[PDB]
């Protein structure tokens, strides 16, 4: 088991007597057990890229190889934890050490031992019964929300020889024992998985059910789908916090995993201060979103491989909750700072630089990351579907999207939510640019929309047209003044203003904009576009006649309709039932039709 | 407790190559083990083991290897990494870049022997920055307020007076005052005149009881220049996290630190990365800058105001560029203001203190402060835009309001930004100066201030 | 049809052999079974990145952007297996596909492919952002083998000349658009404004085409003439007078 340190040069430790070790095997070096990976073998010698500072490591110090490559422990106790980039739990490190520092060479297990959670075995299992990877052998009630499914690791299979009865047990207690080919394996609630390896599935499915964020601008103009991959331009003035907090509080996602991939020291602590304090309604109770989330967190000075691996730990955790049948959402907050940590590994390994100094494989590291998203038929017996979505924030240098990490990310991700400083400076939250943003998933979501919201596809189309006409007409408005435009252009601009200020803007701090259900989003946009179609009909139908309609005539005859349209954002689903909101929208439609009947 | 065993001394120098002396037959050598060299003439010299491999230990000597030989040179291995003799009595004292005193005082009687490398502050233990540090400079305190525990570099360039700004911050800086504040000023690759300026301008002006001063000269060894930030931050960590002090660290030239990293990487025969700097430059800059912030259940907090000489006046260079990625916003010193004799030459337009929203609030300053800074920003920006209009149209073509933004711009540079090297302005006086400039406009023109705030403070 | 799939999550080094498997199957079907085959090579950029990865991981001598110095020959060992061969009725036709990094035509991936293949079909944001499917920009496009394929019995006899004049009119149309964006219509001639109008008529009728709309070359040439008729006969300076006299009034 033990090898010996042969030499040390900066963060790279050469070792000897390592003949039984493997490429990318995880190794503890030095008496303090500094973490590192085998990057090369040269006979009985191995070269270990140490993660932590190597100061003080000596020739002939022990080299204790862990048999497995870099891996994530998976099980109960994942929920609510703040893991670092290599799954050292920062909460356990703080509690056990009673120190403000992470001590060099932590040995703390990722899932806390001695916490004897309530376990229920799967009622269908028996001694002698067949079992396979992804089969649920029991459930652990760790939180009121997440009934944590315990399931056989994807490589393991055979005949069940023991299951624990109902009772209290931890991560180290043996829960299942099974025999295959005459060999017995003992399993606990803890499972261990290689962080760079995809967890296999029965079928990777197309993504077709919306991931609602509760924000009108996102859910209306550029929808995202459960299982989908999306990106955000993360910067100071972008307003990313409005998306991030809203996603965690309101999304139709059963588990959230957030990954700090080298955020700034203070910016990381702002996130780790907020997520405990964020609360969500469930079953008429209020509970901390920490009941349904886990944070991987790394400040910029965390070990290089802790930053680089943090993105892969997040998706390995997220795939594990996907495999339980949960619709997981992953947020990665700094894919640029991850690509910097990736670049630092290549610089230490002396790999040749590609575009802008990033490694040649950056495209493959990103692409194999985002391809781990999607909806799936899970492994094992219950046939259950599950999914991982991935939100990947990117930081274009000075707003330049041509940097290889940003360019590749926007080339890979099927959705982009183009946050823009010019909108946030005017407090236009969520501050998403409705020209620069896009979503490729429309063709796949149209199945769901045709079933549940058949009117919506016409509406989103007309919305984009109205917004595009505003941008194209604005040049003429500057060149000759708004007063010189045609009547069909003037009503188009007013509806574009109505959409911009009273539909796309959403003040999530207020009681009324706190969350916007999809029904409210359709009903608001339906009324705005119905008013546009009637206004457009009135002006175009009277063009070249003696008697003629213009925006001033409409506003003079029905100014209360424009006011009622603006009032729709204030209508609150908590105060007013969905039937009442639907009836009010039916009344606005009848009101505007009767109002236009006075002109035509 | 302590290493009870005796030290070994080796004559077995198998070679010398640039700054490196290669011992052989060494017993159990450590990476970064501190060693003491003795030359043939009996002169002592310092060094660290830059590489270990079997019986070989590649010492990087701190001083140049000149005078070392294979047969009379003796290397003494201390059995440990370099540790800082640290204590609270390091306040009121001046140290060279290795931590040896240069103030005619004794060695430090230490309260601890902290690992020079430090350790990562646990992100769950980290607390968000919560209150202002006065720098005493109006262009910082009234436009770019610095939260206690923020990192905020002063970007500068060759020839600009950023060392004078660094020194003035180090004299004038303190809490808001609506003895528990300490400064750790640490200066790398400093030319001997600027080192006399830092030493004298603090020792002559009473501030020393609340500052610890580290000097590393331009001709001091390049490896001592790497150690200087680590001593500063180790002392700042001791003062804050062992001793509750609020601490402000002034790292006066991160460019010469990065140039020292370039040399230490060349010393390991590593291939150069981006613009000739090491690939791992981001982690080394982060290992300096993230030794900062507040921590759960302690009053202590390390703030950093690095100063950073931008190569070629261009933020795209890896030194400023990587620094912008790690630190929470930046202050720019500007050659335009410098040539116009506006001292401090701090350009408040491109500058941004990212955490100023935390630093400013009711009970931390006057409640109006955030609104004042926003309106001053707008009026100075519009004043610059109107100066560009004046340049095209001449004065007779301007409106009365345009003339107010010009009067504002002239008076704002000549009263708000201009401070002088020894006038100290508390945040209250900076805000009264701010209001004295805002009062140039009619009450209704102050579009970024609430009418309640205007009714309480617009009258003079 | 036969498919070889290497997905973005699959191992990158398989991408070296992924197109070679397709071609090795195409060589069997075409040269041993006399079939005609269209071979599609999706994401030659992701292929070239697998070469860039192997190159960087082997310390191979770099060409531009850090691709291996041999990248041209590796791409040629893929691309050159297209062709007919003597005494066999078979034929391998290749349509490779490549996304250009940062849309740069001078990037090693498009550029080396550019030298090896018989001209390029190109697709452009200037068309796609206006909903002009298929967004095929004709000016950067060409076919090196088109000249030999165009002619009597293969096509209408005029086809070569119609092409030559469509390129000229569309090219002038782009140049007068680039002028107008600075100076407005007041510094353009009436003829320059006609080339600007030709560019609008051309993209809306010639390029714009439905995802299931099928057009023969003959209908395409009738459309081409109805566009070329925008100018007076004497302006069509790439076409011989006999071709004009037969077809211009139709």
């Amino acid at each position: 088991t033990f090898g010996y340190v042969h030499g040390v040069s900066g963060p790279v430790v050469t070792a000897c007597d390592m003949a039984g070790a493997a490429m990318y095997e995880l190794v503890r070096v030095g008496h303090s057990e500094l973490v590192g990976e085998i990057i090369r073998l040269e006979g009985d010698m191995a070269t270990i890229q140490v993660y932590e500072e190597t100061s003080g490591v000596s020739v002939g110090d022990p080299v204790l190889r862990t048999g497995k490559p870099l891996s994530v422990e998976l099980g109960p106790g994942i929920m609510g934890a703040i893991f670092d980039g290599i799954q050292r739990p920062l909460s356990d490190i703080s509690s056990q050490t009673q120190s403000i520092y992470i001590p060099r060479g932590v040995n703390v297990s990722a899932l806390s031992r001695d916490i004897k959670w309530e376990f229920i075995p799967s009622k269908n299992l028996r001694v002698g019964s067949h079992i396979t990877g992804g089969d649920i052998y029991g459930i652990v009630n760790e939180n009121s929300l997440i009934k944590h499914k315990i399931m056989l690791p994807p490589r393991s299979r055979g005949s069940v020889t023991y299951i624990a009865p109902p009772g209290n047990y931890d991560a180290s207690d043996v829960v299942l024992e099974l025999e295959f080919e005459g060999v017995k394996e003992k399993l606990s609630m803890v499972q261990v998985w290689p962080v760079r390896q995809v967890r296999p599935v029965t079928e990777k499915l197309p993504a077709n059910h919306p991931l609602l964020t509760g924000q009108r601008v996102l859910d209306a103009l550029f929808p995202c789908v459960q299982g989908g991959t999306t990106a955000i331009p993360g910067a100071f003035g972008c307003g990313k916090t409005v998306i991030s907090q809203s996603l965690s509080k309101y999304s139709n996602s059963d588990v959230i995993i957030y990954v700090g991939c080298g955020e700034r020291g203070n910016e990381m602590s702002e996130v780790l201060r907020d997520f405990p304090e964020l609360t969500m309604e469930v079953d008429g109770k209020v509970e901390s979103i920490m009941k349904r989330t886990a944070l991987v967190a790394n400040t910029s000075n965390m070990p290089v491989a802790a930053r680089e691996a943090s993105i892969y730990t997040g998706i390995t955790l997220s795939e594990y909750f996907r495999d339980m049948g949960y619709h997981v959402s992953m947020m990665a907050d700094s894919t640029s700072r991850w690509a910097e940590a990736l670049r630092e590994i290549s610089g230490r390994l002396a790999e040749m630089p590609a575009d802008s100094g990033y490694p040649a494989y950056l495209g493959a590291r990103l692409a194999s990351f985002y391809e781990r998203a999607g909806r799936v038929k899970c492994l094992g017996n219950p046939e259950r579907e599950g999914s991982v979505s991935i939100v990947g924030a990117v930081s274009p240098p000075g707003g330049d999207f041509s940097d290889p990490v940003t360019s590749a990310t926007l080339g890979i991700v099927q959705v982009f939510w183009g946050l823009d400083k010019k909108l946030a400076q005017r407090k236009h939250f969520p501050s998403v640019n409705w020209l620069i943003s896009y979503s490729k998933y429309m063709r796949a979501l149209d199945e769901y929309y045709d079933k549940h919201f058949t009117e919506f596809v016409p509406l989103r189309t007309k919305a984009k047209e109205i917004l595009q006409e505003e941008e194209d007409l604005a040049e003429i408005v500057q060149l000759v003044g708004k007063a010189s435009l045609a009547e069909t252009d003037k009503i188009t601009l007013e509806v574009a203003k109505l959409i911009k200020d009273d539909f796309l803007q959403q003040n999530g701090y207020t009681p009324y904009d706190r969350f916007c259900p999809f029904y409210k989003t359709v009903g608001m946009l339906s009324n705005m576009i119905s008013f546009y179609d009637m206004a457009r009909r009135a002006v175009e139908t009277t063009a070249q006649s003696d008697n003629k309609i213009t925006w001033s005539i409409i506003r003079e005859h029905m100014g209360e309709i424009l006011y009622k349209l603006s009032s729709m954002k204030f209508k609150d689903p908590v105060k007013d039932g969905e039937a009442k909101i639907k009836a009010d929208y039916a009344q606005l439609l009848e009101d505007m039709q009767n109002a236009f009947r006075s002109l035509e | 407790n302590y290493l009870s065993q005796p030290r070994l001394t080796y004559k077995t120098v198998s070679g010398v190559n640039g700054p490196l002396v290669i011992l052989d037959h060494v017993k159990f050598p450590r990476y970064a083990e501190i060693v003491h060299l003795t030359l043939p003439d009996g002169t002592k010299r310092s060094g660290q083991v830059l590489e270990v491999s079997g019986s070989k230990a590649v010492v990087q000597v701190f001083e140049g290897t000149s005078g070392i030989d294979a047969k009379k040179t003796s290397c003494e291995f201390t059995g440990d990494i370099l540790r800082t003799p640290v204590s609270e009595d390091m306040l009121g004292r001046v140290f060279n870049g290795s931590g040896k005193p240069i103030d005619r005082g004794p060695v430090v009687l230490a309260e601890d022997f902290l690992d020079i490398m430090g350790q990562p502050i646990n992100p769950q233990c980290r607390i968000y920055p919560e209150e202002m540090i006065q720098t005493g400079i109006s262009a910082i305190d009234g436009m770019n307020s610095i939260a206690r525990g923020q990192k905020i570099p002063i970007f500068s360039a060759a020839g600009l007076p950023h060392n004078e700004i660094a020194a003035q911050i180090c004299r004038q800086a303190g809490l808001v005052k609506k003895e528990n504040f300490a400064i750790v000023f640490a200066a790398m690759g400093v030319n001997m005149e600027t080192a006399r300026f830092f030493k004298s301008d603090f020792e002559e002006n009473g501030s020393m009881d609340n500052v610890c001063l580290f000097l590393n000269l331009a001709n001091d060894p390049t490896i001592e220049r790497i150690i200087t930030p680590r001593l500063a931050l180790t002392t700042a960590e001791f003062l804050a996290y062992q001793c509750e002090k609020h601490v402000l660290v002034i790292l006066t030239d991160m460019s010469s630190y990065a140039e020292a990293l370039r040399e230490v990487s060349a010393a390991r025969e590593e291939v150069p990365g981006r613009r000739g700097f090491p690939g791992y430059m981001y982690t080394d800059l982060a290992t300096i800058y993230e030794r900062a912030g507040r921590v759960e259940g302690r009053n202590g907090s390390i703030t950093q105001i690095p100063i950073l000489t931008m190569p070629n006046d261009d933020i795209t260079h890896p030194i400023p560029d990587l620094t912008g990625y790690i630190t929470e916003g930046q202050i720019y010193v500007d050659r335009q203001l410098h040539n116009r004799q506006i001292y401090p030459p701090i350009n408040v337009l491109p500058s941004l203190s990212r955490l100023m929203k935390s630093a400013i609030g009711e009970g931390m300053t006057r409640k109006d402060h955030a609104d004042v800074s926003n309106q001053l920003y707008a009026c100075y920006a519009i004043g610059k835009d109107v100066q560009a209009m004046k340049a095209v149209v001449g004065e007779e073509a301007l409106t009365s309001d345009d003339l107010l933004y010009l009067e504002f711009l002239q008076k704002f540079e000549k009263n708000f930004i201009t401070q002088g090297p020894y006038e100290n302005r508390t945040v209250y006086e900076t805000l009264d100066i701010g209001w004295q400039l805002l009062r140039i406009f009619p009450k209704e023109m102050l579009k970024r201030i609430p009418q309640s705030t205007l009714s309480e403070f617009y009258p003079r | 049809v036969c498919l070889f799939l290497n997905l973005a999550n699959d191992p990158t080094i398989e991408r070296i052999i992924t197109p070679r498997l397709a071609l090795t199957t195409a060589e069997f079907l075409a040269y041993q079974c006399e079939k005609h085959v269209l071979v599609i090579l999706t994401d030659m950029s992701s292929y070239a990145e697998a070469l860039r990865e192997v190159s960087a991981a082997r310390e191979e001598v770099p060409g531009r952007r850090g691709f291996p110095g041999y990248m041209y020959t590796d791409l040629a060992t893929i691309y050159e297996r297209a062709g007919r061969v003597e005494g066999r009725n078979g034929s391998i036709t290749q349509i490779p596909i490549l996304t250009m990094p940062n849309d740069d035509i001078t990037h090693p991936i498009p550029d080396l492919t550019g030298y090896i293949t018989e001209g390029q079909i190109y697709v452009d944001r200037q068309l796609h952002n206006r909903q002009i499917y298929p967004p095929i920009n004709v000016l950067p496009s060409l076919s090196r083998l088109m000249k030999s394929a165009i002619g009597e019995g293969m096509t209408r006899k005029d086809h070569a000349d119609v092409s030559n004049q469509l390129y000229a009119c569309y090219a002038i149309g782009k140049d007068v658009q680039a002028m107008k964006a600075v100076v407005g219509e007041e510094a353009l001639t009436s003829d320059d404004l006609l080339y600007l109008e030709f560019l609008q008529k051309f993209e809306k009728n010639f390029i714009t085409q439905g995802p299931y709309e099928n057009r023969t070359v003959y209908e395409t040439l009738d459309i081409g003439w109805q566009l070329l008729r925008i100018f007076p006969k004497e302006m069509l300076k790439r076409i011989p007078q006999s071709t004009l006299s037969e077809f211009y009034p139709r």
Binding site: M352 | - | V61, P62
Partner: peptide, 23 residues
Amino acid sequence: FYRLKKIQEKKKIIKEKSEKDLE
């Protein structure tokens, strides 16, 4: 970067050969 990686490789080979020649 490439030129310097090759130089460093040549030095590594010359170091190894110089050690092997002393055995």
